Amino acid sequence: VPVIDLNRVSDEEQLLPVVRAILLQHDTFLLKNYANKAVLDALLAGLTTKDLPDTSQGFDANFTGTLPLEDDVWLEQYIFDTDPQLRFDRKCRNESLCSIYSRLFKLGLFFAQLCVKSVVSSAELQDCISTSHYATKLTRYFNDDYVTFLPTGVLTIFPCAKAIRYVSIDEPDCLLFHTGTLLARWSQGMHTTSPLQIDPRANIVSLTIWPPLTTPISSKGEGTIANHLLEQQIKAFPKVAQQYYPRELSILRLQDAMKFVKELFTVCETVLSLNAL
Amino acid sequence: LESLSNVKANSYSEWITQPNVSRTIARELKSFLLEYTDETGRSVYGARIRTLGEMNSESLEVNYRHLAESKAILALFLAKCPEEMLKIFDLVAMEATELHYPDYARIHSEIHVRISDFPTIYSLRELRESNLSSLVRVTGVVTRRTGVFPQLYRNYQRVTLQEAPGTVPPGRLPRHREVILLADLVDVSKPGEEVEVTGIYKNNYDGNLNAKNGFPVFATIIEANSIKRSWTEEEEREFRKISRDRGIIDKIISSMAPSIYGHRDIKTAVACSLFGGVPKNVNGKHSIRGDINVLLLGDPGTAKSQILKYVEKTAHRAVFATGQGASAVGLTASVRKDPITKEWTLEGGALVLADKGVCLIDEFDKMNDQDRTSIHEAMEQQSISISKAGIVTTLQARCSIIAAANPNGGRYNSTLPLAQNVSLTEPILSAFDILCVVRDLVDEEADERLATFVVDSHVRSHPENARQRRLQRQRKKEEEISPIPQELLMKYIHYARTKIYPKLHQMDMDKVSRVYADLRRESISTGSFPITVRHLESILRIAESFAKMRLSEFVSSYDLDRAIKVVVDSFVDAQKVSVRRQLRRSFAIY
Amino acid sequence: PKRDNLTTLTNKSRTLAFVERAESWYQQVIASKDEIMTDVPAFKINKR
Ligand SMILES: Nc1ncnc2c1ncn2[C@@H]1O[C@H](COP(=O)(O)OP(=O)(O)O)[C@@H](O)[C@H]1O
């Protein structure tokens, strides 16, 4: 896994060649020796020993709140977007999470812009992600079989690259940066990504960034980033989707079945051909 | 041009040998090696060539199915005439990788292609005549292996593959074939390994044998192209469900030998020996075995032999032996000549076959001490050491042992210790983990229960989509006598053995050490048998096996309690009658 | 189903036919407003 060290690569003219070399060969890379890492360790200690999640918040159709999972596992998730048209009023209820979020977003935002600049050839999309135009999702597991997920955000950030699988990563002093599918489709086929695997009982905290969700993915249709985020969230949380998005859940579940039969039919041609000869 | 390759007016090999067709598919092969798509994975072979040129590896690995998608008939021609197709695929892979890594020929002259994941699989008894001069995939056991010598130079090696130990039909010796290994594919396996190999099946003993004798004969060999040494989620959907059910350990034990009454201290010993423990090898120190050793000593009857017949069928790799029918050579190793290299070659015995398996020795007492000495060093070192015919080498013999025996005079002397009821010397007795002492003493309470079980066992096993109907009826009878269907248990045990490696918790250190010190204190107090560290080593092993039954990655307190019960009970029951009653009261808690 | 034991012309085309059959049927199903089936329904074998 590629490693980015601020003590060696910190300038834009230093980072941009490295990020492009990473994205054209890898979908996940490490950040090392970040000054805020020491503060994050203390903040994560409070979140695992004193800052118990508020279970009374519940979980809403906006995919925000404290969603209970199997084996009494709790998942605290918040979604925010700078666009006023989306009513993400259910902001984070914990200050320690906000303390980590601000530190991660301070440098991750620049990295997310670098990721877009590295592979997205569109000059219009160079500034699609900014301080006043962004969408972020904060996720935190809690406990009082690995889950496979494919983030759609441009950049996915973890404060600690430990117990994360895709092969396992056991770097306590390095942060984990991952790129989603939205960056891939805007890269004109130059970049693609792979899903990650995490233990839901590991209390992993994660942050993922999108451009504003109302931004259309392409001019060829009505598809927007909000639809792409909704697609991932419905696939990630089918039980919640049934209450609020039943038809979309059925359509998205159908896609996986239609993918299976295409893959199955691909193999079956070879088997019958071999017996024929 | 690709469509033109389909239109064939000659035989499969004849069309390929045409220079225009050969160059046609050479371009077609060259196009694919860089152009492929796997949705998110895209051109995986581009990365495959990238990492191969990074390593300068001679092993050109390819997946079979991928070629058949981009190039439909190109892969099928490779299957029907592997020798002709791989001949030019050598050059195509050379030129295609030189597109990414030029000047590769500056160091390496050839690129031998390694096919992988070939779908069609044959056994050593299915090699029909029609399979000659074709690519085949077979699975077997490495019995005989030759050394490494150059060939007209590049490395050469020769190996024999033998049928699976547990699948040989009655009345036949194990079928086996000679296999030809080429350079870069030497030392891939060692004797006792179970491997699957893909290669070409052909006859190659022509020449000197023709004029050697009248009606001359040849032999069939396999030219090893690529050798390999596996579950699905739908099956794990069943294993995980049962793993957390109530009384999982009791379902397992009660399903050992369904048509055998009682003897639950043996059935629990059989169950633990099937699952086994966790081997450990500390670097720079010695290793620790995980195999569980069981000794069945009892009076005539009591079905000690029938247990070893049930273990033979249920275990994955079971090798059955008898004390008198076996020999020292027939267990450790034998020697064969080989004209290809002219040095002596060694072929393994029964203990080498049962590596990572179970070795059954019926009537263990009747064999001579020289035969018995080999078995002792087999369980201790888990390896075979031999110096015969100028060959000095060591082979892996990691096998579990289940032994049945008889006491002196054919009846167990209840008033004397076990160490004075059999000719088996004490150092050999110490190699066992579980020592079961079965008595046959008359009592109408036990006899009515046992007889009514047996008289129903015979009326059950009496002989007399139809296949599905018969399997359903057999399943019904399996349920009537056992809680778990047998073939499921066979799969269930295999998954636990392969996947689960339960680990210790230091929280249970007090539970283990305190019991040991308490057991040691009573040893000097009463009894002649001194408690040894090997007993504690036995407790941990069976504790790990009990955890492996539940498919839990960590040792629980419940497993230790049952682990303590089995080892203490065997140690108490082997003592003389006067000492036996004192110890039962002292260990009523355990 | 082809009249010959093997034909690459009927291999890619039938694979494309399956893709065309699947993709077109995918668009047909999504037009429904009711709860769309999450899995492909199983074919029923006619009596021989
Ligand atoms: N405890 C038992 N319960 C049921 N049947 C038994 C039992 N012990 C022996 N038998 C019967 O006796 C036969 C086993 O005899 P055998 O294998 O010669 O015992 P051993 O070899 O230990 O002397 C089996 O066919 C079985 O039906």
Side-chain angles (χ1 to χ4, degrees):
Chain A
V1 179
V3 185
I4 299 184
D5 176 4
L6 304 185
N7 296 342
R8 294 179 174 185
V9 179
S10 58
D11 198 5
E12 188 183 339
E13 274 65 43
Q14 296 169 344
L15 284 162
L16 177 63
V18 173
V19 178
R20 182 174 284 152
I22 286 168
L23 294 175
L24 299 180
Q25 302 295 342
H26 297 279
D27 58 15
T28 308
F29 62 92
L30 294 158
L31 171 64
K32 196 172 186 84
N33 302 321
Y34 183 35
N36 282 306
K37 181 56 173 64
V39 187
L40 264 47
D41 290 342
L43 294 168
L44 290 170
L47 293 163
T48 51
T49 64
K50 296 187 182 181
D51 294 7
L52 279 67
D54 185 1
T55 60
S56 75
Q57 179 165 225
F59 190 81
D60 76 354
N62 310 291
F63 301 93
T64 67
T66 317
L67 179 62
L69 301 180
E70 308 311 321
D71 303 347
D72 306 336
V73 174
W74 297 84
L75 180 151
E76 175 168 35
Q77 171 177 285
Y78 303 108
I79 302 183
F80 176 75
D81 187 340
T82 53
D83 190 337
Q85 293 189 11
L86 302 181
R87 296 186 178 170
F88 294 120
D89 296 341
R90 202 184 314 285
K91 293 184 178 179
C92 182
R93 295 190 176 208
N94 176 262
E95 297 186 33
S96 306
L97 277 184
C98 298
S99 300
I100 292 180
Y101 166 72
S102 60
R103 288 176 173 80
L104 294 184
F105 186 80
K106 182 179 183 289
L107 187 59
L109 176 64
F110 177 50
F111 275 48
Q113 290 174 336
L114 279 161
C115 295
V116 174
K117 188 168 186 172
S118 293
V119 304
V120 181
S121 311
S122 160
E124 307 88 346
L125 291 177
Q126 300 298 304
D127 301 339
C128 66
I129 169 55
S130 91
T131 56
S132 305
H133 304 103
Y134 72 88
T136 49
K137 184 168 88 74
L138 191 67
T139 313
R140 166 178 171 222
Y141 289 86
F142 176 80
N143 183 45
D144 184 21
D145 301 350
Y146 290 81
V147 175
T148 307
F149 68 111
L150 183 66
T152 56
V154 169
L155 182 65
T156 295
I157 308 174
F158 305 80
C160 180
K162 192 177 179 79
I164 297 164
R165 292 205 68 187
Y166 67 94
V167 180
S168 63
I169 315 179
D170 191 17
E171 298 293 348
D173 70 354
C174 299
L175 296 90
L176 193 74
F177 282 58
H178 177 68
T179 53
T181 52
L182 183 66
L183 184 69
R185 290 197 286 169
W186 288 351
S187 76
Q188 296 71 57
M190 294 295 291
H191 170 75
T192 59
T193 185
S194 65
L196 298 182
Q197 286 187 330
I198 60 179
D199 180 355
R201 309 187 193 99
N203 307 328
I204 287 161
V205 178
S206 71
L207 168 62
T208 302
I209 317 183
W210 296 252
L213 301 170
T214 59
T215 308
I217 296 159
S218 178
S219 307
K220 297 185 182 183
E222 303 298 340
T224 70
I225 300 167
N227 307 105
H228 197 40
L229 173 63
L230 177 65
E231 178 209 335
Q232 188 281 334
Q233 284 298 287
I234 287 178
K235 287 176 176 178
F237 304 118
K239 288 188 173 185
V240 181
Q242 181 65 7
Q243 185 168 6
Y244 306 115
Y245 309 109
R247 184 170 169 250
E248 292 71 19
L249 172 63
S250 62
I251 292 166
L252 296 180
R253 278 181 161 186
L254 176 65
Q255 286 191 337
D256 291 352
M258 297 302 286
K259 212 277 175 172
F260 169 81
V261 295
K262 288 172 180 175
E263 188 165 317
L264 181 59
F265 186 94
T266 301
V267 170
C268 295
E269 291 289 284
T270 297
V271 181
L272 287 171
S273 301
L274 274 169
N275 284 274
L277 296 184
Chain B
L1 242 193
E2 296 81 355
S3 57
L4 299 184
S5 301
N6 175 326
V7 182
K8 184 181 58 57
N10 301 300
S11 183
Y12 303 110
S13 176
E14 300 288 7
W15 195 258
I16 297 296
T17 60
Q18 301 177 359
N20 62 323
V21 178
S22 285
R23 287 179 291 163
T24 296
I25 72 188
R27 189 192 62 71
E28 194 181 4
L29 284 167
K30 179 195 176 82
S31 306
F32 163 60
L33 256 63
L34 282 71
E35 301 181 354
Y36 191 56
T37 290
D38 187 28
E39 300 90 66
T40 57
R42 296 186 290 152
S43 313
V44 295
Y45 284 101
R48 291 186 184 221
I49 290 170
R50 191 182 302 131
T51 195
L52 187 166
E54 170 183 39
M55 291 299 297
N56 297 330
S57 191
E58 302 182 318
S59 56
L60 187 271
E61 90 294 338
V62 193
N63 164 285
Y64 177 80
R65 177 58 196 86
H66 303 159
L67 178 69
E69 178 175 23
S70 54
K71 307 309 194 188
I73 40 164
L74 187 56
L76 299 166
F77 298 165
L78 179 66
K80 194 53 52 194
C81 302
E83 177 67 357
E84 297 309 310
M85 294 288 302
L86 293 163
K87 265 172 179 174
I88 64 171
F89 196 9
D90 182 7
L91 296 175
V92 176
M94 171 64 85
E95 68 176 313
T97 59
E98 281 189 333
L99 299 178
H100 284 283
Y101 294 100
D103 303 334
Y104 184 94
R106 203 58 39 63
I107 299 167
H108 329 81
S109 50
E110 288 100 355
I111 282 292
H112 44 56
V113 173
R114 305 300 182 198
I115 304 305
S116 65
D117 306 331
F118 179 81
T120 314
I121 299 166
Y122 311 96
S123 64
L124 303 183
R125 266 184 288 133
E126 282 166 304
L127 298 180
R128 296 295 81 80
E129 185 261 25
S130 57
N131 304 4
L132 288 167
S133 70
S134 306
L135 197 75
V136 297
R137 175 180 175 206
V138 307
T139 310
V141 190
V142 179
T143 324
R144 196 182 77 85
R145 185 190 76 159
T146 68
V148 180
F149 298 97
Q151 182 260 3
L152 306 176
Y153 298 161
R154 77 202 65 71
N155 297 344
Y156 181 84
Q157 192 170 44
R158 173 179 276 253
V159 170
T160 62
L161 292 185
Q162 182 168 331
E163 285 186 274
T167 71
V168 186
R172 270 69 179 229
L173 275 59
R175 299 296 296 273
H176 71 96
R177 304 294 174 134
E178 289 266 320
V179 182
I180 308 304
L181 276 61
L182 309 186
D184 161 80
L185 216 70
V186 305
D187 294 344
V188 287
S189 65
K190 63 189 174 192
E193 291 274 67
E194 175 167 38
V195 296
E196 50 147 294
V197 66
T198 307
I200 314 170
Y201 174 66
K202 56 173 57 171
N203 306 280
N204 85 321
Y205 284 11
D206 308 64
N208 69 80
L209 300 188
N210 295 71
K212 201 178 74 167
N213 200 3
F215 52 94
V217 293
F218 319 77
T220 64
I221 63 78
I222 300 174
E223 184 158 15
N225 176 262
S226 178
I227 195 170
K228 193 176 184 182
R229 174 199 288 87
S230 57
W231 285 105
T232 199
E233 185 172 32
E234 297 74 14
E235 295 280 61
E236 298 183 32
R237 191 176 72 94
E238 196 66 11
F239 300 166
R240 296 305 308 170
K241 181 190 74 185
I242 298 301
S243 298
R244 55 64 170 166
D245 198 6
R246 301 306 181 84
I248 180 56
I249 293 170
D250 304 307
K251 301 321 197 184
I252 279 162
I253 292 166
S254 312
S255 65
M256 307 277 87
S259 310
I260 292 180
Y261 177 80
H263 294 303
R264 202 174 193 89
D265 292 287
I266 321 182
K267 290 194 179 190
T268 193
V270 171
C272 298
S273 192
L274 291 175
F275 285 89
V278 176
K280 310 178 183 68
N281 183 26
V282 179
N283 54 287
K285 190 19 161 171
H286 70 76
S287 180
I288 287 290
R289 88 166 189 266
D291 294 5
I292 278 171
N293 296 341
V294 190
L295 174 59
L296 292 78
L297 172 61
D299 304 305
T302 78
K304 306 174 290 302
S305 309
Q306 294 275 34
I307 285 171
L308 276 66
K309 294 311 189 185
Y310 176 79
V311 172
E312 186 197 306
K313 279 190 56 65
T314 307
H316 176 66
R317 200 202 298 200
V319 180
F320 188 92
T322 301
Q324 71 274 14
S327 73
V329 169
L331 296 171
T332 62
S334 65
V335 170
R336 309 297 182 213
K337 286 262 63 177
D338 194 319
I340 282 61
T341 81
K342 299 285 187 174
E343 300 83 11
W344 299 97
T345 72
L346 184 141
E347 181 194 326
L351 299 163
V352 173
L353 294 177
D355 184 41
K356 301 187 176 183
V358 63
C359 187
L360 310 174
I361 308 194
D362 194 13
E363 301 193 291
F364 180 47
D365 59 275
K366 305 197 184 302
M367 72 165 57
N368 57 76
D369 287 339
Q370 298 306 321
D371 295 334
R372 189 149 51 226
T373 298
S374 77
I375 302 311
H376 182 223
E377 293 179 36
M379 300 311 128
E380 289 300 293
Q381 309 307 96
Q382 304 282 291
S383 68
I384 301 303
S385 301
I386 187 167
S387 180
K388 280 174 58 264
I391 306 179
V392 177
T393 195
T394 307
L395 295 185
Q396 304 301 318
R398 299 158 293 196
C399 61
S400 48
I401 182 166
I402 305 187
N406 288 262
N408 295 344
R411 290 302 323 236
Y412 193 79
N413 181 349
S414 185
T415 74
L416 284 186
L418 207 178
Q420 203 165 8
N421 259 276
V422 291
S423 52
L424 304 168
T425 192
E426 293 182 58
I428 298 186
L429 297 177
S430 85
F432 289 97
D433 299 275
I434 314 305
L435 299 90
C436 300
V437 188
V438 168
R439 279 61 149 228
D440 179 20
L441 78 172
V442 80
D443 197 297
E444 296 93 334
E445 181 54 34
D447 294 342
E448 180 150 310
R449 297 173 180 273
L450 194 157
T452 199
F453 192 64
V454 170
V455 75
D456 293 340
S457 171
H458 287 69
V459 83
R460 191 188 315 293
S461 307
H462 185 296
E464 307 299 278
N465 73 320
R467 298 179 68 209
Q468 189 186 25
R469 303 179 200 184
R470 283 286 182 155
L471 262 68
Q472 191 274 351
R473 193 175 180 82
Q474 288 176 348
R475 274 295 204 85
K476 183 52 57 190
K477 290 168 66 176
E478 289 175 40
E479 290 179 347
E480 284 178 350
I481 194 152
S482 69
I484 300 293
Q486 296 289 315
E487 74 295 330
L488 175 64
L489 182 67
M490 292 180 71
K491 282 169 169 284
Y492 186 110
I493 289 167
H494 198 310
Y495 183 95
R497 281 191 70 80
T498 304
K499 291 292 195 178
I500 317 301
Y501 298 82
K503 204 61 51 66
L504 298 175
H505 279 303
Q506 70 187 356
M507 77 185 293
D508 288 303
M509 180 180 288
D510 280 48
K511 207 180 215 297
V512 178
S513 308
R514 295 178 185 273
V515 169
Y516 178 82
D518 289 335
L519 293 174
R520 282 279 293 190
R521 205 181 306 102
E522 298 306 337
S523 179
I524 185 157
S525 183
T526 39
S528 183
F529 288 23
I531 285 286
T532 71
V533 185
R534 298 170 64 108
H535 293 96
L536 176 58
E537 184 198 310
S538 296
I539 294 162
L540 296 176
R541 257 197 294 279
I542 199 160
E544 294 165 6
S545 203
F546 273 118
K548 203 183 299 183
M549 290 192 191
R550 305 191 289 88
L551 290 75
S552 65
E553 283 276 278
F554 297 97
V555 171
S556 76
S557 63
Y558 182 69
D559 315 325
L560 257 167
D561 294 341
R562 298 187 79 143
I564 284 160
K565 191 214 83 85
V566 169
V567 179
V568 171
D569 181 275
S570 177
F571 187 83
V572 169
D573 193 30
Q575 308 311 307
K576 60 178 78 172
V577 166
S578 52
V579 173
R580 191 173 84 140
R581 188 178 65 179
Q582 304 181 61
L583 274 289
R584 284 198 303 99
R585 289 180 179 167
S586 303
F587 300 150
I589 295 168
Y590 308 151
Chain C
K2 205 239 186 187
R3 303 299 85 205
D4 200 2
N5 74 336
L6 174 65
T7 291
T8 187
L9 180 64
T10 56
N11 187 295
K12 279 185 184 286
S13 66
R14 276 175 48 272
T15 302
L16 183 63
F18 195 84
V19 169
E20 284 188 344
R21 286 284 302 187
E23 200 69 16
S24 183
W25 186 86
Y26 158 75
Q27 290 185 14
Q28 177 184 357
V29 174
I30 66 180
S32 187
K33 294 178 180 177
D34 201 358
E35 188 174 65
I36 279 157
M37 65 210 78
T38 55
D39 190 11
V40 177
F43 172 77
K44 295 183 183 179
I45 294 172
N46 298 315
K47 194 274 170 196
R48 193 177 182 280

